[PDB]
């Protein structure tokens, strides 16, 4: 038998349901979402990190002429200078009054420590979500883990269950993301091939160890103005360091709904938004004929005390009369109130206490004991403690907070003044008829 449900997508909130078929006793069905897993599809754009300016020994063509030559290294900057006059600890390195010339070149490469300090930029799209479900039926437990998409099944422990697409999609990740040292940041990194000095992505490379690098960081040489030999370079501060200083808070402290974001798959887990439509197929063998199921008679409610508490704190008692020893299910088909246990033993005339939770003060509902029904109502009071972190609002409020007394007051206040004006018009026409009679 196939039976469908809509279950809140929130961990640690069991959902109870039944399955009605003629000739078979009802079977309890418990659904639990053990943990969520939202994994998106991503492509690596590039990787950046703190850089290191290489300053190779300046070439000196002395008492001669020399010309600049370009190269392929990233950020390569070249410049010649005439009239230079190198000096060194040994003394004048050549002999000519300013006829010499020296060529100076500089370029950049990622520092060795980058091998562990790299920050890689990612583009993400088409978030996908995977759910682990644990189902319980007929005091038997089954596992499954399926993608919420409905075309994919999950077959496990005699059962194959198909999920349905989320009602409302959540995706904390933005189009652009940055990941570094296990921390994820939401940041619009520059597109590959776009370098701007003094900002993130000043050095870019397809891979960490890619011999080809593209980057410009505004390196300008300066004419030597000292006795000895020295190439003075000047450049803007590293962009990666500047981004590190004011990167802002990470995405852990900003993702809505408390999504625990792990890095190596770059995926969120254990966070709730939306509902899962889920259809369960159950083998007919697991079901039990009503003939062997216990038969109950004269079932009655009694609400000893109920508290309108966030935690499950309402209490109830049921008294039955039966003839066959056995086990029977129990449920509260009213969505406002949720019971605690599903199946209970049944005796000839025994009574059993039940625990439950509710989200409304006017706790009224129909409870199914075994195969039979029973209506019952009571009033609950608010609790002393008003802050607690355990599963709350097992059912969302449905404007049922209005108590019968408030409804009575609102209804009583209103009066039939429309009927009064109608009577006024009626007596007006009656007076016209009276004038006719006069």
């Amino acid at each position: 038998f196939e039976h469908a449900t809509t279950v809140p997508n929130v961990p640690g909130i069991p959902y109870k349901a039944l399955v009605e078929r003629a000739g078979y006793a009802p079977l309890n069905l418990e659904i639990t979402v053990v943990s969520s897993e939202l994994t998106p599809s991503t492509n690596k754009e590039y990787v950046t990190c703190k850089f290191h300016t290489v300053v190779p020994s300046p070439q000196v063509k002395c008492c001669g002429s020399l010309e600049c030559k370009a190269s392929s290294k990233a950020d390569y900057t070249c410049r010649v200078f005439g009239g230079v006059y190198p000096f060194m600890w040994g003394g004048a390195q050549c002999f000519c009054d300013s006829e010499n010339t020296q060529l100076s070149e500089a370029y950049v490469e990622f520092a060795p420590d980058c091998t562990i300090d790299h920050a890689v930029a990612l583009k993400v799209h088409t978030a996908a979500l995977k759910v682990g479900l644990r189902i319980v039926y007929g005091n038997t437990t089954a596992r499954l883990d399926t993608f919420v998409n409905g075309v994919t099944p999950g077959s496990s422990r005699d059962l194959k269950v198909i999920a349905g697409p989320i009602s409302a999609a959540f995706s904390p990740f933005d189009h652009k993301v940055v990941i570094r040292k296990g921390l994820v940041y939401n940041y619009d990194f520059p597109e590959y091939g776009a370098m701007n000095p003094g900002a993130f992505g000043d050095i870019q490379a397809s891979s960490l160890d890619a011999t080809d690098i593209v980057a410009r960081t505004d390196i300008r040489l300066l004419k030597p103005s000292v006795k000895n030999i020295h190439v003075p370079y000047t450049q803007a501060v590293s962009g990666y360091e500047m981004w590190k200083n004011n990167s802002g808070r990470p995405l852990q402290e900003t993702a809505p709904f408390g999504c625990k974001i792990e890095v190596e798959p770059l995926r969120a887990t254990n966070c709730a938004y939306g509902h899962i439509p889920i259809s369960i197929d159950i083998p007919d063998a697991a079901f039990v004929r009503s003939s062997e199921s216990p038969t109950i008679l004269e079932v009655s409610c009694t609400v000893a005390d109920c508290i309108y508490s966030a935690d499950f704190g309402g209490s109830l008692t049921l008294q039955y009369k039966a003839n066959r020893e056995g086990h029977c299910p129990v449920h509260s088909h009213s969505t406002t109130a949720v019971l605690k246990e599903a199946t209970t033993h049944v005796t000839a005339t025994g009574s059993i206490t039940l625990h439950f939770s509710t989200s409304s003060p006017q706790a009224n509902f129909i409870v199914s004991l075994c195969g039979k029904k029973t209506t019952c109502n009571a009033e609950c009071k608010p609790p002393a403690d008003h802050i607690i972190g355990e599963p709350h609002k097992v059912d969302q409020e449905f404007q049922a907070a209005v108590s019968k007394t408030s409804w009575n007051w609102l209804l009583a206040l209103f009066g039939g003044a429309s009927s009064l004006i109608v009577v006024g018009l009626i007596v007006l026409v009656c007076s016209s008829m009276l004038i006719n009679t006069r």
């Binding site: 009064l420 006024g424 007006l428 004038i435």
Partner: protein, 51 residues
């Protein structure tokens, strides 16, 4: 939310009271619209209803 219901209740009751007052005043005027001086009171019950 709670403020809205009270304001709506007040508006509804005020409208109803005004409509009832206007209707009863008009009914009294229609009953009193004839001068009725040539004959005596048509019926003392009508007078009692009027006042």
């Amino acid at each position: 939310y709670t403020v809205i219901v009270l304001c709506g209740v007040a508006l509804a009751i005020l409208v109803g009271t005004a409509s009832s007052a206007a209707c009863i005043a008009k009914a009294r005027r229609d009953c009193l619209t004839p001068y009725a001086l040539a004959p005596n009171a048509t019926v003392p019950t009508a007078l009692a209803v009027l006042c």
